[PDB]
Design a protein around this nucleic acid. Structure first.
Ligand SMILES: [Mg+2]
Ligand SMILES: [Mg+2]
Ligand SMILES: [Mg+2]
Ligand SMILES: [Mg+2]
Ligand SMILES: [Mg+2]
Ligand SMILES: [Mg+2]
Ligand SMILES: [Mg+2]
Ligand SMILES: [Mg+2]
Ligand SMILES: [Mg+2]
Ligand SMILES: [Mg+2]
Ligand SMILES: [Mg+2]
Ligand SMILES: [Mg+2]
Ligand SMILES: [Mg+2]
Ligand SMILES: [Mg+2]
Ligand SMILES: [Mg+2]
Ligand SMILES: [Mg+2]
Ligand SMILES: [Mg+2]
Ligand SMILES: [Mg+2]
Ligand SMILES: [Mg+2]
Ligand SMILES: [Mg+2]
Ligand SMILES: [Mg+2]
Ligand SMILES: [Mg+2]
Ligand SMILES: [Mg+2]
Ligand SMILES: [Mg+2]
Ligand SMILES: [Mg+2]
Ligand SMILES: [Mg+2]
Ligand SMILES: [Mg+2]
Ligand SMILES: [Mg+2]
Ligand SMILES: [Mg+2]
Ligand SMILES: [Mg+2]
Ligand SMILES: [Mg+2]
Ligand SMILES: [Mg+2]
Ligand SMILES: [Mg+2]
Ligand SMILES: [Mg+2]
Ligand SMILES: [Mg+2]
Ligand SMILES: [Mg+2]
Ligand SMILES: [Mg+2]
Ligand SMILES: [Mg+2]
Ligand SMILES: [Mg+2]
Ligand SMILES: [Mg+2]
Ligand SMILES: [Mg+2]
Ligand SMILES: [Mg+2]
Ligand SMILES: [Mg+2]
Ligand SMILES: [Mg+2]
Ligand SMILES: [Mg+2]
Ligand SMILES: [Mg+2]
Ligand SMILES: [Mg+2]
Ligand SMILES: [Mg+2]
Ligand SMILES: [Mg+2]
Ligand SMILES: [Zn+2]
Lengths: 159, 205, 56, 104
RNA sequence: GUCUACGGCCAUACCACCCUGAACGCGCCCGAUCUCGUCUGAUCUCGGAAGCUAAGCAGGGUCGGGCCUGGUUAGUACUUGGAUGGGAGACCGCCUGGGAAUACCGGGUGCUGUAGGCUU
RNA sequence: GUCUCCGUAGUGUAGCGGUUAUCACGUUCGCCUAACACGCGAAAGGUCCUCGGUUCGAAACCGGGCGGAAACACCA
RNA sequence: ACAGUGCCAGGUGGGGAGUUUGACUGGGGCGGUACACCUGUCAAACGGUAACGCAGGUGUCCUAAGGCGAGCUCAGGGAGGACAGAAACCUCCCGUGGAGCAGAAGGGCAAAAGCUCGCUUGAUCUUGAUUUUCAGUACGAAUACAGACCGUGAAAGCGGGGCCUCACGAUCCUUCUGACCUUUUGGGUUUUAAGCAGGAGGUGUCAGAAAAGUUACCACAGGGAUAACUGGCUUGUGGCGGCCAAGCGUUCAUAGCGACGUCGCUUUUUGAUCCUUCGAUGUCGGCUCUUCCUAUCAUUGUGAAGCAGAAUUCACCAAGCG
RNA sequence: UUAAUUAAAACAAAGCAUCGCGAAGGCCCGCGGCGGGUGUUGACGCGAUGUGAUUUCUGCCCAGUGCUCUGAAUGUCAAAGUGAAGAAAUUCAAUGAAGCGCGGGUAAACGGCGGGAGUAACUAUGACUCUCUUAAGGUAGCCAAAUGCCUCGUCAUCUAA
RNA sequence: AGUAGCUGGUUCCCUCCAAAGUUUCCCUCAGGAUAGCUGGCGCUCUCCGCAGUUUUAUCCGGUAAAGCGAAUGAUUAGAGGUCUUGGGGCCGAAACGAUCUCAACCUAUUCUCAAACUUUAAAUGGGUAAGAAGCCCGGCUCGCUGGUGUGGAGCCGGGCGUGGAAUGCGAGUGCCUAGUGGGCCACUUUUGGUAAGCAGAACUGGCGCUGCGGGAUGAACCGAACGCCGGGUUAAGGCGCC
């Protein structure tokens, strides 16, 4: 069997990228995390304190507690046939604001403005996204040039 | 002394180099990969034939040694000791193990090193011969004979590259005229339009 | 005698018979595990809410 | 392991850091009239032979060292147990390490 | 056009060598009474203002190395799903989708926030 | 094959992590004897089996080799 | 006044009694520990993932090798300098770490996490939450805080052990520490004893019995979950046979042989495995008797020889008869 | 002698050699006693062992494990008794039976009884020597013996083999 | 009526639902406890929520491949310098004087490689989001933080429905609970072994528990899953005769 070691199998996961070792940029420490924020967990091997467990590397959670150096994250973990909402304490080095919801918040603001602005102009605008439709009919001009004829090439043993 | 080569023909195990974990590997049967007139300049042997593997398999260091002798002797007899240069293009790095039986059985069955083999892919060159353009017939015959020392199917192919270089034979001469190629013994260094202009001055002075 | 050692064969089939249900979500989460110093003041903030009742 | 014979650490009686005398803890001799030793004697009497297990399969080769602290305040003299990790060799107030010395 | 202090990203910013640097700066620089520290006022600390851009530093240069970024490599290698496909096998082809990396060729060579100067 | 152990002057052997690498025999030089032996006074001579490693320092301690020697190998 | 006997106490006591004499395991035993743990790989780019899989490590070590601060920069190399030489010490230059950080490995680290100094004991007291294994139990280890006392620094801060990943232990019992503590049974005082809380004494079979053999005089319950025949898959080993052709054969590769290599066949060898049989398939050899195969020793009909004859060798059709 | 798979080389045996015991004893039985067997006995006896007629001989080892003998000289050592502290429970000390330790004896008690190298004027051996070594280092005998793996040992005899 | 974690047996019909041979602990390995898988009883609602799926956003990763004129490790061949070190020579008085020559060394190239290497780097894959529990305003509480009426959280009132991707589908929740805890087979991936109808894993699907058409025959292959029937048409397979 394997060992139950805490950091087994993290040889590459927690190592620093190529030529990106050394000091941690201080903007990592200047980010503002608030209750309810969505953060991507990513263990950084440079700082060994508050390291998230390997199972949480690459998961995205929600901030619920904020301390001097770390935050509390509610992150789903699947164990066998059930999913548990787990609460981890992770130093802010090993997290980053998730941009998954930013596209949504951008859309909400755009939606509301169009909803508000169109209302005063008495028009119905589309708000819901849609899947990419089949492309509509169109014309392809030849510009007086015959399409290039293609043929398969002969085999050659370029060994 | 060793098992029939059918036992270790196929690439069934991951590559198993002689490393700090696999200790006690006996030396490979083949120790010489270049023979003939190795010191001939790039311009003396424009022709190159290849023995190309048509299968994904393992060749034993014993069969590499056997083929090398087979191809080398025929060339010495039909072209002279100074009329060719042979380069075996496979090195036996993968190690094959043996679980020696006389009795535990299959308990503790991991095997000790038994030998070495080269893992060859389809379309991969097994060995190469460069010589003069008038010995094209003797190159094919040398490589045709050497095929009988290897399992599986191998194809002979006369390359379009000049000798053991990576540059096509139909233009190699033109590139050397304008100093895009610089002979450096058996091969040619490539001169790009890059780097300090001093190096250009040296080539043109 | 010897027997099988371990497997997870048939396990994702059993897990999905009653579905891999996500955890239940309520609009109010428990304050369990939050900073004790911050929770102490939040209780004090609630405790005196009624002081500004008339002003509200 | 080498430990100083004094250390300024926390005293519970005083509620503040105080100097402490440090010594090794030693198990006291067993009382004949402790309830556990009285029950054992009565059960071991008469016939029946041994009645409790006798442990044989010892495995540990060291013990956890417990340091007996005492507050040096003449009025307090409170004591506390402070266990440290396992060690084969333990001493109190041994010679302190020196750096850049020739070893003879 | 540009610098000083403090920075963000952390080579398009690095490394080697060469050229040029108005003004103010930043420096080199001159000393050791005091503060401070040394085997040594070299460094560190302190007090200064005779000299100099020599160097640091700034800008530029190099068919420059690196680095960043494209092209090619190549719809190649690899790959998800399919067949009562081929082949003794090893393996390979096709159908349905995804899709790399060298060598080789080209382009680029720091951006910028806060505050404060110089430059008619 | 599994397990345990051993390699030190020419021979047989000690070495209680810091030695001028112990003892006996052997070899050499000189006395003694007409000579030999015995004996007396001196001298020399260790690839610490080999490679690597920990250590401030390895002949020793720990691993990989090279030879050697024991003990086992049963129920059919 | 002892023998002796009654009752206690210490020794002896397989004469006798009871009982035990681990587990995993390509049968069991012997051997190993894959039994509690840790690193890399396997492992198929979340996590998880087996084998007596592979390469290794652990039961320790540290008054500093813990904590803070400051100051420095390492391995290696180049070039110089009395003795000084490959190697002593001094100087300048290059040096992205190629060093060091107790140890296995992997990760991390350069005005530091390394080295050297100065001061120190955050390796202290305390309640909860969390993570890892996970049953979302325990321990162990670890993470964020919170409340006190502190250290260090000019300060921001950092620190409640070791840069991170291992370095460990329930109940019962014993021992120590703590309180103007509770109980100590009708009340009171006092010794004692028992409670409550936190350490330690240990269970390495490491969620934790107290444990030697032999049986061929043997027994029961079972097992084809499991060994000793046959049979089956496989064919490494054994046997037999091809292909290439360096050589041998005075000459001459192939009359006859044939290295280095390589492709097969057979199940008359041994293995490997454990599929059938343990509410029983009688276990070696010989004798006797029939039958079948051909990979042919002889005989019939043939081809080739380094076939003059004779003798012999190679090969073909061939298992009728020996 | 294994009734009913073993008739034997197994057991017994005379012979031989040990050992205990002089009776309030040795050896043994018995739950029990002024109990019982040997014993209607007395060392030419009774009890406990080994070997196994005769013949010849029975070597060395007391370190190990046993057995045995001497003991206040004398480490450890229970209860009881003695002394001191205390309110007592209790604690502490002093003393010190056997047995263990200590020292002798004993192998017809259980048992045990080496290794390396050099050396004689052909070669071979090596009487001889050196060395490490144990409590002795296997002596007189005997042997491919019912005991020897290698092994169907080597030589001779017995056969055509 | 000793105990038996072991062998054997365990008696009527129909209807409905329907497993497991896996996790952890156990002197645990032929057995238990435990979670999972099952059944039954319901209840709380409904006529927003959810999903073994895709889309759109956004992260995570170090395998396939590739690389080695990039680090580590292994490795073939020549070429140019070379006094900075050696072996041979070699003319001497002789030296770092001359002379080559072969080596080490250095610089560019070159052949071949890695499960316990790597700058790169897929496919398949894992997490999250796609709103009313949202958005936007005004106010109030604080013993927390604080140059600031700053920050943060909490609470009160108010206003906004184009319910803000596709598709499909009613959901939530609680008790009690048996059997199981020997598995085995196939595509792909994969460890050991010469290999095995061998031993050990991942994924899905199967057999076990399951008939039926085809593969002559057959646990697993191919097709397809089953109330009792009539007609029609098919799948995989077939159409000389059987
Ligand atoms: Mg394999
Ligand atoms: Mg099982
Ligand atoms: Mg008693
Ligand atoms: Mg000026
Ligand atoms: Mg100065
Ligand atoms: Mg200048
Ligand atoms: Mg450039
Ligand atoms: Mg610039
Ligand atoms: Mg007894
Ligand atoms: Mg008994
Ligand atoms: Mg067993
Ligand atoms: Mg995966
Ligand atoms: Mg520092
Ligand atoms: Mg605190
Ligand atoms: Mg440290
Ligand atoms: Mg009273
Ligand atoms: Mg018997
Ligand atoms: Mg027997
Ligand atoms: Mg079976
Ligand atoms: Mg068999
Ligand atoms: Mg064979
Ligand atoms: Mg010839
Ligand atoms: Mg099986
Ligand atoms: Mg039967
Ligand atoms: Mg029969
Ligand atoms: Mg029968
Ligand atoms: Mg025939
Ligand atoms: Mg009988
Ligand atoms: Mg009879
Ligand atoms: Mg006797
Ligand atoms: Mg005798
Ligand atoms: Mg004796
Ligand atoms: Mg004997
Ligand atoms: Mg004799
Ligand atoms: Mg005789
Ligand atoms: Mg005889
Ligand atoms: Mg009954
Ligand atoms: Mg009964
Ligand atoms: Mg059982
Ligand atoms: Mg237990
Ligand atoms: Mg059964
Ligand atoms: Mg990996
Ligand atoms: Mg690869
Ligand atoms: Mg299998
Ligand atoms: Mg069943
Ligand atoms: Mg089913
Ligand atoms: Mg079916
Ligand atoms: Mg068929
Ligand atoms: Mg019909
Ligand atoms: Zn105190």
């Amino acid at each position: 069997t394997n060992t139950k070691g805490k950091r087994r199998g993290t040889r590459y996961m927690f190592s620093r990228p190529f030529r990106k070792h050394g000091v941690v940029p201080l903007a990592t420490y200047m980010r503002i995390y608030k209750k309810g924020d969505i953060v991507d967990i990513k263990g950084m091997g440079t700082v060994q304190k508050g390291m998230p467990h390997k199972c949480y590397h690459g998961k995205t959670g929600r901030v619920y507690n904020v301390t001097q150096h770390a935050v509390g994250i509610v992150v789903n973990k699947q164990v066998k046939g059930k999913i548990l909402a787990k609460r981890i304490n992770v130093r802010i080095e090993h997290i980053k604001h998730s941009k998954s919801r930013d596209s949504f918040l951008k859309r909400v603001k755009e939606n509301d403005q169009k909803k508000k602005e169109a209302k005063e102009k008495g028009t119905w605008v589309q708000l819901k996204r849609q899947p990419a439709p089949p492309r509509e009919a169109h014309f392809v001009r030849t510009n007086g040039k015959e399409p290039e004829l293609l043929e398969p090439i002969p085999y050659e043993f370029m060994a | 002394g060793r098992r029939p080569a059918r036992c270790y023909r196929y690439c069934k195990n991951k590559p198993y180099p002689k490393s700090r974990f696999c200790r006690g590997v006996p030396d490979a049967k083949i120790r010489i990969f270049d023979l003939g007139r190795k010191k001939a300049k790039v311009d003396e042997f424009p022709l190159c034939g290849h023995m190309v593997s048509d299968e994904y398999e393992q060749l034993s260091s014993e069969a590499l040694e056997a083929a090398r002798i087979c191809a080398n002797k025929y060339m010495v007899k039909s072209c002279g000791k100074d009329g060719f240069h042979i380069r075996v293009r496979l090195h036996p790095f993968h190690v094959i193990r043996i679980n020696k039986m006389l009795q535990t059985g299959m308990r503790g069955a991991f095997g000790k090193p038994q030998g070495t083999v080269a893992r060859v892919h389809i379309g991969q060159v097994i060995m190469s011969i460069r010589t003069k353009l008038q010995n094209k017939e003797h190159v094919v015959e040398a490589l045709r004979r050497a095929k009988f020392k290897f399992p599986g199917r191998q194809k002979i192919h006369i390359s379009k590259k000049w000798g053991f270089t990576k540059f096509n034979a139909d233009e190699f001469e033109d590139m050397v005229a304008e100093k895009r190629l610089i002979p450096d013994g058996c091969g040619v260094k490539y001169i790009p339009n890059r780097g300090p202009l001093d190096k250009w001055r040296a080539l043109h002075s | 005698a010897k027997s099988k050692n371990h497997t997870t064969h048939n396990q994702s089939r059993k897990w999905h018979r009653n579905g891999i249900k996500k955890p239940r979500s309520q609009r109010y989460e428990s304050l369990k595990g939050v900073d004790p110093k911050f929770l102490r003041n939040m209780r004090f903030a609630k405790k005196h809410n009624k002081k500004g009742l008339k002003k509200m | 392991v080498n430990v100083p014979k004094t250390r300024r650490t926390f005293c519970k009686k005083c509620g503040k850091h105080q100097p402490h005398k440090v010594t090794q803890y030693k198990k006291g001799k067993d009382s004949l009239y402790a309830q556990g030793k009285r029950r054992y004697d009565r059960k071991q009497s008469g016939y029946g032979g041994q009645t409790k297990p006798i442990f044989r399969k010892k495995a540990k080769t060291t013990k956890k060292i417990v340091l007996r602290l005492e507050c040096v305040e003449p009025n307090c003299r409170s004591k506390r147990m402070l266990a440290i990790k396992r060690c084969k060799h333990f001493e109190l107030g041994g010679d302190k390490k020196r750096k850049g010395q020739v070893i003879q």
